């Protein structure tokens, strides 16, 4: 399955332990597009509808109406993982470059790669 | 449990699906140190001894003798994840800044954040 960075998919993240975000949920593809094209795995960030506002500097708000979600959500760039593509089902949307610039910043904060 | 970016720990990554790296194994802490201090989760990259040389630009070689491993290994910056700290057991070592600069580069390649 070929996916693209910026794509939002449903993925089954279960099973999990403790404070890991689990379940079948929207996730954001954050791996590079070479990996996304040739690798059997993708790297994704969990998205939650449990909150609507950022609590951490690794959170990016998704306005539901603007971005094609049912409900205002938050991308958790502190909740990331590499998944086999067989966990993926439906493509939900693709976030634009302005939104991805924010995700990039949050990802840098989450992994201590701040260059700005 | 307080961990530090650059620390190498054993973590139980199981269960997994498909091409996800699983088992109890050495992993590298790549999350920022605020998260590492106050969060119940850490973000880590899987390390493998199955290979000794980089096959991808997301791979970083660990010379066993230089860095305190039993065997020449490879850090897989394409195999990353957020884990509850309860998966962690033994601290193996702490990689120096010169090595972490290479890991940072590989992580940027893996997540399309190249700024160099």
Curated annotation (Swiss-Prot), chains A, B:
A GO biological-process term: mRNA catabolic process
Phenotype for residue 79 to A: Not toxic in E.coli
Molecular functions (GO terms): DNA binding; RNA binding; RNA endonuclease activity
Class in the EC hierarchy, top level: hydrolase
Top-level taxonomic group: Bacteria
Positions of the record's site feature: Transition state stabilizer: 25
Effect after changing residue 71 to A: Remains toxic in E.coli
Effect of residue 56 to A: Not toxic in E.coli
Effect of residue 78 to A: Not toxic in E.coli, 625-fold decreased RNA-binding
Effect the entry attributes to changing residue 90 to A: Remains toxic in E.coli
One Pfam family of this chain: PemK_toxin
Other known facts: Replacing all Arg residues by canavanine yields an enzyme that recognizes a longer consensus sequence UACAUA, thus altering its substrate specificity. Still cleaves between the first and second nucleotides.
Protein family membership: Belongs to the PemK/MazF family.
Described purpose of this protein according to its UniProt entry: Toxic component of a type II toxin-antitoxin (TA) system. Specific for 5'-UACAU-3' sequences, cleaving after the first U. Yields cleavage products with 3' phosphate and 5' hydroxyl groups. Cannot digest substrate with a UUdUACAUAA cleavage site. Overexpression is toxic for cell growth (shown in E.coli), probably by inhibiting protein synthesis through the cleavage of single-stranded RNA. The toxicity is reversed by the antitoxin EndoAI. Toxin activity cannot be inhibited by MazE from E.coli. The EndoA-EndoAI complex does not seem to bind its own promoter.
Assembly with partners or alone: Homodimer. Forms a complex with antitoxin EndoAI in which the toxin activity is inhibited. One dimer binds a ssRNA substrate, forms a heterohexamer composed of alternating toxin and antitoxin homodimers which inhibits the endoribonuclease activity. Antitoxin prevents RNA binding to the endoribonuclease.
Protein name (record): Endoribonuclease EndoA
């Amino acid at each position: 399955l070929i996916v693209k960075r910026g794509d939002v998919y449903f993925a089954d993240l279960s099973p999990v332990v403790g404070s890991e975000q689990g379940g079948v949920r929207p996730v954001l593809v954050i791996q590079n597009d070479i990996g996304n094209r040739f690798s059997p795995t993708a790297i994704v960030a969990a998205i939650t509808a449990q909150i609507q506002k950022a609590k951490l500097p690794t959170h990016v708000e998704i306005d539901a109406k603007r971005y094609g979600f049912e409900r205002d959500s938050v991308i958790l760039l502190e909740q990331i993982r590499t998944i086999d593509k067989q966990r993926l089902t439906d493509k939900i949307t693709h976030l634009d470059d302005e939104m991805m610039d924010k995700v990039d910043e949050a990802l840098q904060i989450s992994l201590a790669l701040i260059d700005f």
